A = this chain, B = another copy of it.
Amino acid sequence: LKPQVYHVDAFTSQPFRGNSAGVVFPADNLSEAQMQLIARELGHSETAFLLHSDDSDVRIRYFTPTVEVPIHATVAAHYVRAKVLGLGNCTIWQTSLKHRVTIEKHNDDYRISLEQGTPGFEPPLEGETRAAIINALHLTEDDILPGLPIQVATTGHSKVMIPLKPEVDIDALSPDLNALTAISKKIGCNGFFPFQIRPGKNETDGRMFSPAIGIVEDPVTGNANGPMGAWLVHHNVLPHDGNVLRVKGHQGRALGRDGMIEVTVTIRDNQPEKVTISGTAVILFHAEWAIEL
């Protein structure tokens, strides 16, 4: 009933791993300035504030330490909400600046599934742009998965797909961040997602670099892994039954912030129609605010 603050690691079961987020609940009597102040104070890359909706179950506003942003803190918010309310195996609808969410409960723990936006792809990056991206990661053409493009994919917040051979030491990558930033201005995408596929498995390991927006590396990124799953279907990279492809995306190992996202792609005529991402989380602690508001 009183404002509480939750410190949550999203897309993991292990404390101190995953992608940390704040959740403040309930946030009904906070102004935009108060929410911005709290987000700055907690210092997570994102803090979620959960409120009452008159046409849904929940409205959520997300703030970085400096500015409001859109719909990992989503998984955190709904995990917290499920735990506090004692939610069951149900469907929830989110309004925020109408998004379908599913909650599953196994063993007194929760998994949260978010349906993403329409999959889409931009024309492949070829020639000098391709070579510029490869050189910025300090790789060569021989490091790239043969016959496949470097290419922006999206389910609502676009990312550059960079398909690497399994032989590549993805954890040793240390990109030229200024060069990535210069490329971002030419291609209209701020996030770069090198990833590789585990041999014989519908599983991947990736890293998401986004220096153009001040985030050098994001530990676990739903908006990268979702489009990667769509992309794998679109370029027929992983075997599937033509109906559903499930990929377990791993991210964050080099940061000591290992996380996991399950990506489920619905398939029609061998093209990705819909993408859902799912993950769990762990609450490290929660408290009532000891101060007024």
Contact = CB atoms under 8 A, between A and B. Distances in A.
A40 B257 CA distance: 11
A138 interface: no
A20 B44 contact: no
A121 interface: no
Nearest to A38: B16
Interface string A104-145: 000000000000000000000000000000000000000000
8 tightest Cβ-Cβ pairs between the two chains A and B: A287-B287, A285-B287, A43-B43, A15-B291, A16-B37, A285-B290, A285-B289, A283-B290
A288 interface: yes
A161 interface: no
A291 B287 contact: no
Interface of A: 5, 7, 15-16, 20, 37-38, 40-41, 43-44, 282-291
Contacts of A5: 285
Contacts of A289: 284-285
Nearest to A14: B291
Nearest to A41: B16
A37 B284 CA distance: 12
A15 B291 CA distance: 7
Question: Taking the full assembly, how many copies of this chain does it contain?
Answer: 2
B40 A16 contact: yes
A285 B288 contact: yes
Contacts of A20: 41, 43
Contacts of A38: 16
Contacts of A288: 285
A20 B65 CA distance: 14
Contacts of A7: 41
Given A5-B285, A284-B289, A285-B289, 4 more contacts: A15-B41, A20-B41, A286-B287, A287-B287
A44 B20 CA distance: 14
A7 B288 CA distance: 12
27 contacts: A5-B285, A7-B41, A15-B41, A15-B291, A16-B37, A16-B38, A16-B40, A16-B41, A20-B41, A20-B43, A41-B284, A43-B43, A43-B44, A282-B291, A283-B290, A283-B291, A284-B289, A284-B290, A284-B291, A285-B287, A285-B288, A285-B289, A285-B290, A285-B291, A286-B287, A286-B290, A287-B287
A9 to B, nearest CB: 8
A38 B289 CA distance: 20
A289 B283 CA distance: 9
A175 B282 CA distance: 41
